[PDB]
């Protein structure tokens, strides 16, 4: 059974799948995340409607 668990872990060890090392996300409490959400909520209905105007601006920046 120990050899079975060794072969099982040994197959887990040869994982060969995507893996990323990223360790820093500090300064979130300092961010007024709730406040920006309040800005976003009042602005969301404006942003969604402004999408064609925002795209027409971006298109002129893609040149």
């Amino acid at each position: 059974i120990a050899n079975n668990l060794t072969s099982a872990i040994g197959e887990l060890k040869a994982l060969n799948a995507a893996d990323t090392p990223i360790p820093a996300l500090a300064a979130l409490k300092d961010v007024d995340l709730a406040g920006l959400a309040n800005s976003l909520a009042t602005l969301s209905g404006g942003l969604v409607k402004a999408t064609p105007a925002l795209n027409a601006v971006l298109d002129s920046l893609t040149d």
Partner: protein, 322 residues
Amino acid sequence: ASVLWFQGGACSGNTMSFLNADEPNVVDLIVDFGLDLLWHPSLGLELGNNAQKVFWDCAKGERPLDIFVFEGTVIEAPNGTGQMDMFAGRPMKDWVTDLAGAAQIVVAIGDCACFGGIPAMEPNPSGSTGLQFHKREKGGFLGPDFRSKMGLPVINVPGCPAHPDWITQILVALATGRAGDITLDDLHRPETFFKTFTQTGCTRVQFFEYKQSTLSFGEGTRTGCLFYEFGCRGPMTHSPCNRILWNRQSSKTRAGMPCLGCTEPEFPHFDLAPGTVFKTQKVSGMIPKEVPEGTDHLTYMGLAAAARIAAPQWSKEDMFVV
């Protein structure tokens, strides 16, 4: 019972397999079971106009046609004309239309005839299709609603090729008054052969149970199941290949060859795309993309881990030893 056996986009493997028949052998089937083989391209004596006379008499109803066996695909190319398969002065598909409409029973033998098979692999240059299926999709050449004069759909004896018993025992059943014993599954395959899986009777199921994989071909197949590393479709393929052995000897899986799922309408599975031949496609390198029929990846994998941990020692050693 008159039998007309035609070949469309066939390689004649179903005929050759059929000729391997034992109990009954092919000669005893043709002679001693009251099955009058009117013609067969590999066996019929008649050629040319005499053969065409036989065919036309069957097609027009001048003589009864009890069983029309069709092997090979219904070739429709080019442009639906079927002229990539010209037989006895007509596109073979026209013969198929007439004879399937004339026969009491229509039997498609082999995947080509049943579902389109290998010739129907993309890009399908021959415009090949099966009699009543194109791969899994019902309808094929004759349409989903085709029924022979005995009311049956095309009896699909799949396989590439079909095992001789898959047809001969059906023919014996028809000849011995047991037609009513023949039940067909959703693919019109005889359930007497296609309720089991290829895995049923496979010599490697104990290795499968304990998730012990064959690691390599040759001597590597003295142990293990081929499902994990060689893409064995045994547990996803309905067949009696391990119940009724091939050539009365063996089966692919017993011999160490993965079942290619040839009795299944998708055969060849994944159209033999790169990386799919004698390989198990896996997610994250551990989880097979396809699990056995009727299972789910989470319960399969959980049971697989449990089986691995509880595996006996013999399941991890050669068993098909010299």
